[PDB]
Amino acid sequence: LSDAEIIQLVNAKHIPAYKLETLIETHERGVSIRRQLLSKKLSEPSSLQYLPYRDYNYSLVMGACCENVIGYMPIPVGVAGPLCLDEKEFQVPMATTEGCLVASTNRGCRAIGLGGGASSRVLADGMTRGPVVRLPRACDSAEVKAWLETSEGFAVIKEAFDSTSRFARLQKLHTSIAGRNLYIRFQSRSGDAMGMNMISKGTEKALSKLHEYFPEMQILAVSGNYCTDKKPAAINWIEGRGKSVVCEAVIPAKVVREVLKTTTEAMIEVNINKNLVGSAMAGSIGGYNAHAANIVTAIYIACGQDAAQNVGSSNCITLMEASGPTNEDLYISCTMPSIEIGTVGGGTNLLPQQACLQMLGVQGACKDNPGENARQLARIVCGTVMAGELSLMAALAAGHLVKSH
Amino acid sequence: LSDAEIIQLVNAKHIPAYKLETLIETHERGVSIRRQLLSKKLSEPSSLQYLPYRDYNYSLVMGACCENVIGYMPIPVGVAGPLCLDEKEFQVPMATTEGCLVASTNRGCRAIGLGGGASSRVLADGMTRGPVVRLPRACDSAEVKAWLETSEGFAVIKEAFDSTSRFARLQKLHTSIAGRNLYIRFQSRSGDAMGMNMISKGTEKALSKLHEYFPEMQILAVSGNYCTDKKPAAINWIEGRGKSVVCEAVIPAKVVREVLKTTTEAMIEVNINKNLVGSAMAGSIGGYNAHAANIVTAIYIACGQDAAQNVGSSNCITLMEASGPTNEDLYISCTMPSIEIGTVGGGTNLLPQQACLQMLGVQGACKDNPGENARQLARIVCGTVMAGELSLMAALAAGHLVKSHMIHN
Amino acid sequence: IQLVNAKHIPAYKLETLIETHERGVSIRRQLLSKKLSEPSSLQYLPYRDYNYSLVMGACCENVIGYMPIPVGVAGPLCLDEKEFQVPMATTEGCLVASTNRGCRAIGLGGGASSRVLADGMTRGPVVRLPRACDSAEVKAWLETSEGFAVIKEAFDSTSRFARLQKLHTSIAGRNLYIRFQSRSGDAMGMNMISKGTEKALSKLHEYFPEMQILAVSGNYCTDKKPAAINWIEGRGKSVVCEAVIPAKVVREVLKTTTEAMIEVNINKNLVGSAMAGSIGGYNAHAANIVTAIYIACGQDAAQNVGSSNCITLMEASGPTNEDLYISCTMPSIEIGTVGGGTNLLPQQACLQMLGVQGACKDNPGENARQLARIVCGTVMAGELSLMAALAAGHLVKSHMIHNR
Amino acid sequence: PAYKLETLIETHERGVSIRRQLLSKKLSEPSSLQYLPYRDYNYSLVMGACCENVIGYMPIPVGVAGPLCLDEKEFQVPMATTEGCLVASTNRGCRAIGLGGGASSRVLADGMTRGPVVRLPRACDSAEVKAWLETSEGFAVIKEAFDSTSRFARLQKLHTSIAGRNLYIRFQSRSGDAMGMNMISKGTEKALSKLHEYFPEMQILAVSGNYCTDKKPAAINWIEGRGKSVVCEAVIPAKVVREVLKTTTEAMIEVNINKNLVGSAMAGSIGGYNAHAANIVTAIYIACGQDAAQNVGSSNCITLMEASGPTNEDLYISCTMPSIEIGTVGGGTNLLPQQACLQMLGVQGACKDNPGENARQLARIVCGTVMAGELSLMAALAAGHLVKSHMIHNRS
Ligand SMILES: CC(C)(COP(=O)(O)OP(=O)(O)OC[C@H]1O[C@@H](n2cnc3c(N)ncnc32)[C@H](O)[C@H]1OP(=O)(O)O)[C@@H](O)C(=O)NCCC(=O)NCCS
Ligand SMILES: CC(C)(COP(=O)(O)OP(=O)(O)OC[C@H]1O[C@@H](n2cnc3c(N)ncnc32)[C@H](O)[C@H]1OP(=O)(O)O)[C@@H](O)C(=O)NCCC(=O)NCCS
Ligand SMILES: CC(C)(COP(=O)(O)OP(=O)(O)OC[C@H]1O[C@@H](n2cnc3c(N)ncnc32)[C@H](O)[C@H]1OP(=O)(O)O)[C@@H](O)C(=O)NCCC(=O)NCCS
Ligand SMILES: CC(C)(COP(=O)(O)OP(=O)(O)OC[C@H]1O[C@@H](n2cnc3c(N)ncnc32)[C@H](O)[C@H]1OP(=O)(O)O)[C@@H](O)C(=O)NCCC(=O)NCCS
Ligand SMILES: NC(=O)c1ccc[n+]([C@@H]2O[C@H](COP(=O)([O-])OP(=O)(O)OC[C@H]3O[C@@H](n4cnc5c(N)ncnc54)[C@H](OP(=O)(O)O)[C@@H]3O)[C@@H](O)[C@H]2O)c1
Ligand SMILES: NC(=O)c1ccc[n+]([C@@H]2O[C@H](COP(=O)([O-])OP(=O)(O)OC[C@H]3O[C@@H](n4cnc5c(N)ncnc54)[C@H](OP(=O)(O)O)[C@@H]3O)[C@@H](O)[C@H]2O)c1
Ligand SMILES: NC(=O)c1ccc[n+]([C@@H]2O[C@H](COP(=O)([O-])OP(=O)(O)OC[C@H]3O[C@@H](n4cnc5c(N)ncnc54)[C@H](OP(=O)(O)O)[C@@H]3O)[C@@H](O)[C@H]2O)c1
Ligand SMILES: NC(=O)c1ccc[n+]([C@@H]2O[C@H](COP(=O)([O-])OP(=O)(O)OC[C@H]3O[C@@H](n4cnc5c(N)ncnc54)[C@H](OP(=O)(O)O)[C@@H]3O)[C@@H](O)[C@H]2O)c1
Ligand SMILES: CC(O)(CC(=O)O)CC(=O)O
Ligand SMILES: CC(O)(CC(=O)O)CC(=O)O
Ligand SMILES: CC(O)(CC(=O)O)CC(=O)O
Ligand SMILES: CC(O)(CC(=O)O)CC(=O)O
């Protein structure tokens, strides 16, 4: 009954630490006991003292977001804004430990606001899963590909795929062959969820159905890296993954001068030679921007997104052009083809992250139009990336990078 | 003064919300006031109710880690281990909201442990900065490239570069031309720091010195994306950035079967067709792995690293093959050429993150040998990625991916 | 001559003045020789008894002669129950010998099988609208079945063979890149497709008068530059071929073992290409085969850039897993049997050796499709032989013998 | 054995004649051979160096573009092609450059490479080998073994990368006037044999492990260079852009940025930041006995354009090609017609006084000609003249 007694009972080599909660009836106590057990295995027993753990809702975490829990990690949250986007104003929450990130993003928002605001559009929406399957011969895999490309073959596959969820709907298939191997990229809507588990479940049922028509087919892995999830890949850049978005703004010369502390000409010379030529010299696929990843990461951590998806979600091409009467105003656009995001599921099930989603008006399911909350969040991310690009690029043009962060 | 009064003064004097801490005495109250000012601008005024802010040390955060602070975001931290690596045992902290991640990584550690442990080696260590400068003509930039390629030219540059720090020591230069533009990749050690600020500071000094020899040289940007920082780039994959690490282990056939629920043969087939052929089909540069990004991200967030660096720090090639007298055992290796990490600076200045660094035995500076703590952390990251790769690949091979996520995610 | 040098007349306009193609070439050679450091240089560059009338207006300008490229033959290549004698134009010693060796291994193994997976040449122009919100509108428009229909009608009206199949539209702010993919009969199709694109864009401009057409090619095709889009989406013909080589053949013909071949294939064509940061280059030397057949058959040799895209795979097969299974997948073979260099006689001769010259009157596209299958199958033969030489340590030795 | 005909018979020509007769019987259309030329060609120089099982030769039309005014010299550039408009377009670009006062170029680097794959029992062992290779002493003994195989192959550096227990070693070496693949391969084989003496547990898997990288697109070639890395530039007068190129400097720049930078980025290109460098490279290569299959990496190029002059009306242009694989001795350059084209450029054979200078000069000509090609095509694209020019010169 006491923690000490429980620690002894467990230590009889009888019970693994990860099973503590399913033994006691209070999540926090399981965490407390795991911490005690862990302490005696550390070269510095008192190192956990500064890792917080009390008064946190572990009931929402267990069975959904983390195992073998020992506490939580507080990440400072700052706010940038208002971000004037599509005739609305957003106060953007950003979780980071990088000094100057929030300040810089706030400054970009200020330049956009004084510039009359930004406009964005969602160009596409579809999470993907790319399993790898194999047939006895390439002649066979070629036949399966041809079958999948017929309207009836696709129809059969879509029915099986769509049956696994209320929101997952198969839009298309991109099939690629490597000898007897066949990589099938399933692309589907997923309501307001980022959709990975949903799409994977749909894929699983669709492959089972395909097997009925081709019993010789061997499913090697539900993910054959053709999705592509959490690894850099030209396929995400070119075909899109999740939400594809574009945003733009014109910053008046006076604003570029007073808020950004530079000139339109200087910003354009840096953008072309850094974000286009520089990224090209570095052999980048999708990295034609200054720091989209910083903004994507901060918003993702703050809003319960999958931070590991910053790998592909940060894909962005930032463009700048002289505009206006005397070509002294700055036109800027950011195009992000693969923002993997959601307002339902995963980390968005937790209360603090729901608070940040509420701050933006996109928490949970959009009752009146499924998928609209996720689309709106993707639009906010793209616009905030643009605000960040504006400020960092201005700092680089003026020579202010080092002097601040 | 009261909260209402402080607010009225703010609005009235049109005062920046970000300057509140310089106005009030206590940091927490400034955050409270900021939250109050913000609540009035929200469509849902009660939004901040469940966003915590009390009892946190904001003094360490201000002027170093975040601005316009409205609270903190708690990320669950779990533990995977022991990770048996280089004759040592590590208890690895992982901050995540992805169910199954800690369980899977823990399973991989268990497999590695029953197999006698993993071995790792740091192959290179050097953070980089790649500014872009321009000359009047390409014939001029070609001259500058030649000059930087001389032992004497490199000497003068190294001298200026190193003068900015007790730890930043320039190791080499990689210079490339694009017409009249010249991209110079400075590569330098940085003690136990990730080094981005340190290196940028040294680069700025070296460029000023370069300018004394070539006054017609225009310095366009201290970062010309040739570093490359926080964007996918072949240069990081091929030349490395930060720490280049390799690790390996052999998992006995019995362990692959009982712990991983599959076979060495199935593991190899999935690895080759997914991590090699699959990534090739997808057009990946550096993504020849299953989920290195998951492990990298979780450890980074737990240990005060820069999570946005997951972009390049996640580069990894995971390889598997048959081993042992009967070729029944599973040999696995993970090679990560660009792990950007540090144990001093940035978020590692915060106490909770120092707690996770302390669990690993790598918090702060290694006074006896600057850089040893950061190197050790890089080894732990590579070994943990390897544990994670082992478990996910096994789940993919056995058809357990979706099922496991239905239970824990 | 004194005339030309006086009036400063350009050498390229010589054929107009003269009434003989060959005499125009002769006089151009004389003018050129005077300007050279060594005037006797042109002596060994042949020009006589060649039909310049076929070249003029179709294949080359300011002509001074022709360059003979040695042509060798490899085969029989036993593919899809047919046997081919493949002509290869090259100056690289060992290439024909090695390819011939691969054909022999394939033949003793019972032959190769191939399939054409897709067929569509592309053109990717770049256009721009005043704003990104405007370009997004055009992209949505092109994605409606009605929008696509009007664009297709305009495109297809420029030709009896070019038939638009699909569009892939992508945005970069206010810029819009539109990848037109179209069948092209037996032609490689670049001119046909560019013509169709030009007409299609004019039609789109009727609907969006604020649209500026920047360039008929905005590099989103992509033609003659390495690009992930060709590797991923295909371009021209996507083909796959395979074969199983008996263990005994691998030892006797290839001088190696199935295990050694597999180990080299995985660590070189997969792991090494990944270490090198390759997109589409998961093979040993597909480019050598493609180039040699292309030059021999009047193809556009500059398209070796993307046509060479290939992933070569190897695995153990058979009763005791001692036989060698091999497959080569080429998603972007840009090829044709009508148009361009295929209008010339010697190159038509090489196409005729393969039985694919000119138009397949009863089913346009069949001759080009067959040629694409032969290319893929020949690449596979070449892949087998070079990989065996690499596994056994024979590369440098063979080149000292046949390539020096 | 048909390929041994020349061994038994007298004349090379008769052997080709007989092989052709043998082949005839295997063709479904034997009369096709009637239009494949074979008579009166120097087969002696071909056998043992450039081709096997020879049945004749393929004539490729050769046109000339120029003069190309480059580095205070003038070159008449030979181009073998069947693409109508190519020579005309390249000639126009040359004309524009000449009227602009000529182009200037620089060779930035020179080193052919070979990237074998070897393997050790463990990654810990491969890590040790990598570290040894990174010492001046390790490099020194490897260079000694490598260099002993040639009078021209001189090892310059090594780039070693591992993937677990596998080790990829990129050897970079000078090669006199030769493109150097054979020379570098021979040096690599000896250097690996020596490395094995230091590390007996090392398995040499393949002399080429695709880390070179030869004839496959690869970021390593783009970033580190291969063969010759060259840059070229010129300024075209406003009146010339208008009169010769039929366009404006502003239109040129706009097309260049949006096609060659943005468009190539959209397509996911690594090294393809140009309009048609591959066309020029391929035509010169075929005419000059180069290895046309190397157009894969030799074509790598970034083309840049900016405004110049008092009112920004002149056009500045530069082309940067980091991986031109080329040579003036060896391979196809052993044949007479291709030697005639190399002689046209003044770079045929060995530069006896300074080995390496003829190949370096040829690489500069290639970069300069690509730049002339880029200028003309970009102008045609900006002006809307592409399709029209090809209907005129590239269609029977
Ligand atoms: C730090 C930085 C924002 C200061 O900008 P500045 O123009 O020199 O300083 P200013 O006092 O003139 O303020 C300009 C704007 O910056 C923003 N800003 C400045 N300091 C800020 C802070 N401490 N907190 C929040 N927002 C801040 C404000 O939105 C805006 O002023 P206003 O809304 O009160 O009218 C700028 O130097 C910068 O962004 N550099 C770092 C850029 C970067 O992105 N670094 C790499 C990624 S972290
Ligand atoms: C969830 C999962 C770990 C369960 O594995 P399993 O082998 O079927 O279950 P077992 O009960 O036999 O446990 C095997 C091992 O897993 C680990 N493990 C299992 N459940 C665990 C949990 N809830 N918490 C922590 N560790 C756990 C243990 O190290 C070890 O058990 P042990 O106490 O005997 O040493 C497995 O399905 C998995 O890893 N799936 C892949 C998830 C994944 O990697 N997704 C990728 C994105 S994170
Ligand atoms: C030169 C090479 C073909 C000789 O192969 P080999 O097996 O050692 O020699 P063999 O005498 O046993 O002949 C085996 C087969 O090779 C082929 N072959 C060999 N020499 C040949 C030649 N001179 N001409 C044409 N075909 C030849 C034949 O198809 C076949 O012999 P066969 O008449 O009995 O049917 C081989 O060493 C090789 O392929 N190496 C170079 C590989 C390569 O691809 N080079 C790099 C890219 S070009
Ligand atoms: C065909 C093309 C060269 C005609 O150019 P143009 O400017 O309209 O025609 P012009 O009569 O005004 O001649 C202009 C210049 O072009 C060159 N030129 C034109 N026709 C030529 C021909 N038939 N042969 C050789 N050179 C020619 C000349 O060098 C130069 O004039 P000059 O030397 O007599 O003083 C041009 O339309 C073009 O280059 N388009 C094709 C572009 C291309 O690169 N094709 C794609 C891949 S090959
Ligand atoms: N295993 C993997 O492949 C993988 C890969 C990367 C990340 N992840 C992890 O997966 C998690 C997110 O997965 P997920 O996005 O699919 O969440 P999920 O929690 O697995 O699925 C969403 C659930 O919410 C329900 N739902 C209700 N209203 C909805 C609405 N409006 N829109 C959408 N869904 C609604 C859905 O119903 P239905 O049951 O009817 O669909 C479904 O059960 C994260 O933790 C991430 O880290 C997993
Ligand atoms: N601006 C950018 O370009 C950029 C880009 C990406 C990330 N970042 C951010 O940069 C931050 C990290 O920068 P940083 O890694 O350079 O840390 P840093 O805090 O800026 O620099 C390290 C400091 O610690 C001192 N130090 C003491 N003992 C040391 C030891 N053993 N090893 C190393 N340094 C020691 C150094 O001395 P000296 O003064 O003598 O050097 C130096 O002052 C993160 O928050 C990250 O998010 C910045
Ligand atoms: N400018 C560019 O865009 C570009 C780019 C790369 C290469 N090229 C060059 O383009 C040339 C090849 O162009 P192309 O392939 O479009 O050839 P093409 O010669 O321009 O067009 C083929 C012509 O043959 C006719 N034709 C008759 N029977 C046919 C059949 N069965 N199949 C197809 N066409 C048939 C076509 O009819 P219709 O008139 O009814 O269509 C058309 O007039 C090469 O020389 C290449 O180097 C050009
Ligand atoms: N097998 C492969 O790895 C491979 C790959 C791609 C292409 N290739 C083929 O390789 C062939 C060319 O190979 P290579 O370039 O190495 O030529 P090479 O003909 O194999 O070697 C050049 C020979 O010329 C001698 N030489 C005399 N004067 C020279 C000078 N000034 N500069 C350089 N060498 C001089 C060299 O002397 P030393 O004996 O003292 O060195 C050597 O014997 C082409 O046909 C190409 O298609 C082969
Ligand atoms: C400045 C940068 O490193 C990002 C950062 O400071 O966090 C990105 C770049 O512009 O290269
Ligand atoms: C399973 C995976 O999606 C990662 C995850 O679940 O978080 C990665 C993959 O194998 O593609
Ligand atoms: C051997 C090779 O260089 C091609 C050749 O010899 O022409 C290709 C390779 O395997 O890297
Ligand atoms: C015009 C082009 O296709 C090349 C050619 O016509 O041969 C290249 C381009 O995309 O600009």
Coordinates of N, CA and C in Angstrom, one line a residue, chain C residues 363-400:
Chain C
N363 N -1.6 1.5 -85.4 CA -1.8 1.8 -83.9 C -0.6 2.7 -83.5
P364 N -0.8 4.0 -83.8 CA 0.3 5.0 -83.5 C 0.8 4.9 -82.1
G365 N 2.1 4.8 -81.9 CA 2.7 4.7 -80.6 C 3.3 3.4 -80.4
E366 N 2.8 2.4 -81.1 CA 3.4 1.0 -80.9 C 4.9 0.8 -81.2
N367 N 5.3 1.5 -82.3 CA 6.8 1.4 -82.6 C 7.6 2.1 -81.5
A368 N 7.2 3.2 -81.1 CA 8.0 3.9 -80.0 C 8.0 3.1 -78.7
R369 N 6.8 2.5 -78.4 CA 6.7 1.7 -77.2 C 7.6 0.5 -77.2
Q370 N 7.7 -0.1 -78.4 CA 8.5 -1.3 -78.6 C 10.0 -0.9 -78.4
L371 N 10.4 0.2 -79.0 CA 11.8 0.7 -78.9 C 12.1 1.0 -77.4
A372 N 11.2 1.5 -76.7 CA 11.4 1.8 -75.3 C 11.7 0.5 -74.5
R373 N 10.9 -0.5 -74.8 CA 11.1 -1.8 -74.2 C 12.5 -2.4 -74.5
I374 N 12.9 -2.3 -75.7 CA 14.3 -2.7 -76.1 C 15.4 -2.0 -75.4
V375 N 15.2 -0.7 -75.2 CA 16.1 0.1 -74.4 C 16.3 -0.4 -73.0
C376 N 15.1 -0.6 -72.3 CA 15.1 -1.1 -71.0 C 15.7 -2.4 -70.8
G377 N 15.4 -3.3 -71.8 CA 16.0 -4.6 -71.8 C 17.5 -4.6 -72.0
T378 N 17.9 -3.7 -72.9 CA 19.4 -3.7 -73.2 C 20.1 -3.1 -72.0
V379 N 19.5 -2.1 -71.3 CA 20.1 -1.5 -70.1 C 20.3 -2.7 -69.1
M380 N 19.2 -3.5 -68.9 CA 19.3 -4.6 -68.0 C 20.5 -5.6 -68.4
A381 N 20.7 -5.9 -69.7 CA 21.8 -6.7 -70.1 C 23.1 -6.0 -69.7
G382 N 23.2 -4.7 -70.0 CA 24.4 -4.0 -69.6 C 24.7 -4.0 -68.1
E383 N 23.6 -3.8 -67.3 CA 23.7 -3.8 -65.9 C 24.2 -5.1 -65.3
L384 N 23.8 -6.2 -65.8 CA 24.2 -7.5 -65.4 C 25.7 -7.7 -65.6
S385 N 26.2 -7.4 -66.8 CA 27.6 -7.6 -67.1 C 28.5 -6.7 -66.3
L386 N 28.3 -5.4 -66.2 CA 29.1 -4.5 -65.5 C 29.1 -4.8 -64.0
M387 N 27.9 -5.1 -63.5 CA 27.9 -5.5 -62.1 C 28.7 -6.8 -61.8
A388 N 28.7 -7.7 -62.7 CA 29.5 -9.0 -62.6 C 31.0 -8.6 -62.6
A389 N 31.4 -7.8 -63.5 CA 32.8 -7.4 -63.6 C 33.2 -6.7 -62.3
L390 N 32.3 -5.8 -61.8 CA 32.6 -5.1 -60.5 C 32.8 -6.1 -59.3
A391 N 31.9 -7.1 -59.3 CA 31.9 -8.1 -58.2 C 33.2 -9.0 -58.2
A392 N 33.6 -9.3 -59.4 CA 34.8 -10.2 -59.6 C 36.1 -9.4 -59.7
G393 N 36.1 -8.1 -59.7 CA 37.3 -7.3 -59.8 C 37.9 -7.2 -61.2
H394 N 37.0 -7.2 -62.2 CA 37.5 -7.2 -63.6 C 37.4 -5.9 -64.4
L395 N 36.8 -4.9 -63.8 CA 36.7 -3.6 -64.5 C 37.9 -3.0 -65.1
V396 N 38.9 -2.6 -64.3 CA 40.1 -2.0 -64.8 C 40.8 -2.9 -65.9
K397 N 40.9 -4.2 -65.6 CA 41.6 -5.1 -66.5 C 40.9 -5.1 -67.9
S398 N 39.6 -5.2 -67.9 CA 38.9 -5.2 -69.2 C 39.1 -3.9 -70.0
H399 N 39.1 -2.8 -69.3 CA 39.3 -1.5 -70.0 C 40.7 -1.3 -70.5
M400 N 41.7 -1.9 -69.8 CA 43.1 -1.8 -70.3 C 43.2 -2.6 -71.6

